[PDB]
Amino acid sequence: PTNRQIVLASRPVGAPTADNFALTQSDIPTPAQGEMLLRSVYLSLDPYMRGRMSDAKSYAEPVGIDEVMVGGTVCQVEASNHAEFEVGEWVLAYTGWQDYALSDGEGLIKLGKQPSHPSYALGVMGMPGFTAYMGLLDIGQPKEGDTLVVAAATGAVGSMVGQIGKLKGCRVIGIAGGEEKCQFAKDTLGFDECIDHKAADFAEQLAKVCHNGIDIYFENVGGKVFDAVMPLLNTGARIPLCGLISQYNATSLPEGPDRMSMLMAQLLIKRIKMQGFIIFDDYGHRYGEFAADMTQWLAQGKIHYREHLVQGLENAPDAFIGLLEGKNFGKMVVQTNQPR
Amino acid sequence: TNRQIVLASRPVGAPTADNFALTQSDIPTPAQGEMLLRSVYLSLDPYMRGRMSDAKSYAEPVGIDEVMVGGTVCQVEASNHAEFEVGEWVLAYTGWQDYALSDGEGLIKLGKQPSHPSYALGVMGMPGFTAYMGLLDIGQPKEGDTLVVAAATGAVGSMVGQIGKLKGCRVIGIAGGEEKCQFAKDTLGFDECIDHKAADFAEQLAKVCHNGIDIYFENVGGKVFDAVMPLLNTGARIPLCGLISQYNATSLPEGPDRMSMLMAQLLIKRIKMQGFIIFDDYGHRYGEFAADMTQWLAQGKIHYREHLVQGLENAPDAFIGLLEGKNFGKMVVQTNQPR
């Protein structure tokens, strides 16, 4: 009768390794009046967690040494003394890489006692879909005929961005690692083109398919991908800035002269809006509209959601390492437990 | 004769007199549906430094032996348009010359006998409008926002700070040397103004920006932005209007590449950085701007300083003086006595 936990053993140096994570046990905490006990079924693994393990200054305190790794979870209520929550109720929570956690109410019921595809609340109906929706529609502001480019195209956020872009009237050009993912983005995700960033002539290929330039670049990756994108940006382009995965493993900045002023020069001469956003901020007023649109778009067949499910909490570290290596196909989720 | 100041050679580093040549040409003839404009006032502005360089930009570089570009206040010497009558004052973009042809694209301002017509190059023109569009549409100031703007006593910067103040911002200027900083505070209504020549500039800025920076109106870039960047708040906004500090640069700064550090900061602080060029199509906004600024002027909330230099042939030296920061207020050159 134990709460297993994956904790941060040490901060990664470059790419995370198994040694950076430790599996530990703890007595199941007891809900103390007005609280409830959540038991996890699904755990989301996402690229932004790499940043959360690092000491870099960020939007949140880094995960402490020997503290439980953080993350979104789909749980059911094991026991409740809240009691606006009944036992057996499924919930979207943020309880991290463990079996159990206490909660004073902050999640959202999803979708009750017997929901269909509850793991979807971690993907298309959850944070990655909402990230795409908010970033693309509010910052990108797609118009009919806009050219939209997004990297990590077959990943959770990117695939949502591309498909929402397509239904909003964009020409959609993906960027992804390897020909199989590029072919999947075109064949199944409805991308107009998808360019392999591993190709020796990656930048020329991108330029070739973006023959009318780029109006929206949804930024997930940074690094060499953004370097290929930048010269193709159109006047009045928009750049929703969501993540910079390519640099999360860096231990130093690139050599060579400082190009920071070149970025600023380009934003000016092309009149570009570049805007960062963090999806965990207070967008409560927007969840409902998002949920309504996405439910409709899924039903209309305009959204294809791919899930990558790994069994076992103890496999979360290797799965997470696998995710960062690009050995994932679609949104990565770990089933931590059999449901009750 | 139509005198012209032409680009003789592209500047290397700071412009010199040799980069400019004075030439003459026969006064052009308006050919039916056209008109002949005769300049009275010529605007001199920092962005012209960029127009002289070979750099890729929003506009084609000024050609060698071509007439220098710029906003002008002219009157109609002769018109066959003829929605324009002779003697009518106009805001145009005819550059550093006495005369030029026009098929109508300017705006009548303010008729045959306007008050302060040179103001259409300043508080009521491009610098005022630049400040207005950048600050209000991109900056979106709220009461209590801390606004920082460099080149604080320059034309755009002065307007940004004063519009910022009347929108409820705490306004911190940045300028070169103690006199401009004192003038910004005493005459332009800046709450503070920090000397960017000070060895502890960055700490001085941090000291007065004790609750951080919510809006940074970017005119300058370089060392100033380097001091600003760590002080930016979550949700900050950065209207990007110019980068004067690098207009003289012949190479990129040394040291490792910080492009990814800027991008990381824009993400973790959820910042909006947005370039804009004031010569784009904002025609639909001109009336609202003129109306708002007329009101703010009447309300005593806007102090406009003009620096008027006599003689077209002094435009090169005046402009060089402007870039050296030897200007006080908006630089205008009177090219001719009016008719």
XYZ file of C-alpha atoms in Angstrom, chain A residues 22-254:
233
model
C 15.302 7.944 -8.778
C 12.340 5.745 -7.871
C 11.277 6.071 -4.243
C 8.357 5.082 -2.035
C 6.278 6.949 0.511
C 3.238 6.217 2.654
C 0.013 7.279 0.950
C -0.833 10.760 2.273
C -4.107 11.201 4.155
C -6.678 13.844 3.123
C -7.248 16.116 6.112
C -10.800 17.513 5.918
C -11.591 19.625 2.860
C -8.945 17.679 0.958
C -9.001 14.612 -1.295
C -6.727 11.750 -2.335
C -5.946 11.460 -6.051
C -4.712 8.241 -7.633
C -3.071 8.635 -11.046
C -3.894 6.596 -14.127
C -2.131 8.545 -16.854
C 0.966 10.752 -16.761
C 1.869 13.248 -19.473
C 5.494 13.460 -20.630
C 6.282 16.728 -22.445
C 9.438 18.443 -23.796
C 9.056 21.452 -21.419
C 9.883 19.179 -18.466
C 13.539 19.161 -19.577
C 13.597 22.855 -18.790
C 11.961 22.229 -15.424
C 14.809 19.898 -14.436
C 17.418 22.524 -15.279
C 18.591 25.412 -13.099
C 17.868 27.957 -15.847
C 15.706 30.857 -14.718
C 12.224 30.235 -15.970
C 8.541 30.853 -15.323
C 8.594 28.396 -12.412
C 11.042 27.274 -9.707
C 13.225 24.394 -10.934
C 12.272 20.974 -9.618
C 14.137 20.457 -6.331
C 16.666 17.678 -5.772
C 14.888 14.580 -4.421
C 11.521 16.245 -5.187
C 8.856 14.529 -7.299
C 9.066 15.255 -11.035
C 6.248 17.548 -12.195
C 3.580 17.005 -14.819
C -0.041 16.824 -15.855
C -1.955 13.752 -14.804
C -5.276 12.060 -15.342
C -6.454 10.667 -12.007
C -9.567 9.383 -10.297
C -10.626 10.363 -6.765
C -9.534 7.549 -4.415
C -11.165 9.187 -1.377
C -12.717 12.604 -0.779
C -13.428 14.799 2.235
C -13.725 17.965 0.140
C -16.500 17.159 -0.692
C -17.540 18.763 -3.971
C -15.734 15.771 -5.430
C -17.193 12.276 -5.138
C -15.102 9.090 -5.081
C -14.513 7.494 -8.483
C -14.623 10.862 -10.262
C -12.009 11.259 -13.012
C -10.001 14.498 -13.028
C -7.348 16.399 -14.942
C -4.738 17.353 -12.372
C -1.073 18.347 -12.091
C 0.192 15.813 -9.554
C 3.409 14.730 -11.246
C 5.239 11.443 -11.532
C 3.665 9.604 -8.583
C 0.804 7.245 -7.703
C -0.906 9.491 -5.165
C -1.282 13.122 -4.114
C -3.482 15.352 -1.977
C -5.629 18.099 -3.480
C -7.693 21.009 -2.140
C -9.622 21.239 -5.414
C -8.001 22.917 -8.423
C -8.438 20.436 -11.275
C -11.413 19.922 -13.548
C -13.833 16.997 -13.591
C -13.304 14.997 -16.751
C -15.566 13.672 -17.635
C -17.172 12.213 -14.563
C -17.266 8.628 -13.373
C -17.198 6.972 -16.791
C -15.513 9.150 -19.428
C -14.562 8.055 -22.916
C -10.877 8.488 -23.814
C -9.902 10.154 -20.501
C -6.221 10.172 -21.574
C -7.242 12.703 -24.275
C -7.337 15.363 -21.534
C -3.518 15.271 -21.694
C -3.384 15.771 -25.448
C -5.917 17.028 -27.974
C -8.417 18.043 -25.267
C -5.701 19.180 -22.874
C -2.512 21.205 -22.572
C -0.962 20.535 -26.012
C -4.210 21.208 -27.873
C -4.887 24.314 -25.790
C -1.304 25.555 -26.323
C -1.760 25.250 -30.097
C -5.212 26.857 -30.030
C -4.248 29.841 -27.872
C -0.893 30.395 -29.545
C -2.094 30.077 -33.128
C -5.451 31.817 -32.935
C -4.675 34.641 -30.469
C -1.094 35.453 -31.517
C -0.835 33.918 -34.991
C -4.236 35.228 -36.110
C -4.398 33.095 -39.272
C -6.120 34.470 -42.355
C -7.214 32.555 -45.450
C -4.120 32.130 -47.623
C -1.544 32.574 -44.841
C 1.488 30.320 -44.940
C 1.977 28.603 -41.583
C 5.184 26.822 -40.631
C 5.675 24.681 -37.525
C 8.535 22.417 -36.404
C 8.214 19.178 -34.417
C 5.224 18.682 -36.740
C 4.199 15.195 -35.590
C 4.659 16.018 -31.895
C 1.724 16.924 -29.646
C 1.709 20.695 -30.011
C 2.936 20.852 -33.601
C 0.405 18.427 -35.018
C -2.388 20.404 -33.361
C -1.033 23.682 -34.679
C -0.821 22.376 -38.236
C -4.340 20.948 -38.245
C -5.976 23.982 -36.663
C -4.062 26.078 -39.165
C -5.402 23.968 -42.039
C -9.013 24.351 -40.903
C -8.476 28.139 -40.593
C -7.467 28.394 -44.246
C -3.668 28.221 -44.061
C -1.166 26.626 -46.313
C 0.643 24.427 -43.779
C 4.291 23.495 -43.981
C 5.703 21.238 -41.316
C 9.247 20.614 -40.195
C 10.153 17.288 -38.593
C 13.012 14.849 -38.034
C 13.241 12.053 -40.586
C 11.279 11.092 -43.679
C 8.756 8.833 -41.907
C 7.473 11.608 -39.649
C 7.418 13.998 -42.644
C 5.408 11.500 -44.679
C 3.004 10.903 -41.763
C 2.413 14.663 -41.358
C 1.397 14.898 -45.036
C -0.537 11.613 -45.324
C -2.382 11.613 -42.023
C -2.041 15.056 -40.450
C -3.047 16.956 -43.594
C 0.086 19.101 -43.827
C 0.592 20.505 -47.332
C 4.371 19.908 -47.102
C 6.765 18.637 -44.456
C 10.504 19.188 -44.631
C 13.124 16.953 -42.999
C 15.370 19.122 -40.774
C 17.953 16.333 -40.827
C 18.354 16.765 -44.601
C 21.738 18.171 -45.648
C 19.923 20.805 -47.740
C 17.153 21.388 -45.178
C 17.237 25.192 -45.509
C 17.066 25.130 -49.314
C 14.194 22.652 -49.238
C 12.257 24.905 -46.840
C 12.897 27.963 -49.004
C 11.710 26.012 -52.039
C 8.307 25.058 -50.589
C 7.814 28.446 -48.872
C 7.887 30.169 -52.278
C 5.514 32.906 -51.065
C 7.319 33.286 -47.744
C 6.135 32.564 -44.191
C 3.303 34.521 -42.522
C 3.108 32.577 -39.268
C 5.937 30.658 -37.663
C 4.783 28.786 -34.575
C 7.980 28.437 -32.545
C 8.500 25.181 -30.546
C 12.133 24.446 -31.218
C 14.469 27.375 -31.912
C 18.105 26.722 -32.910
C 19.000 25.694 -36.460
C 15.327 25.349 -37.414
C 14.612 28.985 -36.599
C 17.820 29.974 -38.437
C 16.370 28.393 -41.617
C 12.990 30.043 -41.032
C 14.075 33.602 -40.291
C 15.139 34.668 -43.811
C 11.810 33.424 -45.215
C 9.574 35.488 -42.969
C 7.148 37.848 -44.684
C 6.378 41.450 -43.831
C 3.776 41.391 -41.080
C 4.592 37.818 -40.026
C 3.603 36.563 -36.573
C 5.617 34.288 -34.293
C 3.800 32.673 -31.388
C 6.681 31.636 -29.158
C 5.909 28.513 -27.227
C 9.116 26.563 -26.584
C 12.776 26.288 -27.542
C 13.377 22.552 -27.206
C 16.556 22.473 -29.359
C 18.424 24.458 -26.725
C 17.181 22.808 -23.504
C 20.227 20.486 -23.509
C 22.793 23.188 -24.278
C 25.600 23.721 -21.772
C 26.923 26.843 -23.528
C 25.854 29.440 -26.151
C 26.913 29.085 -29.807
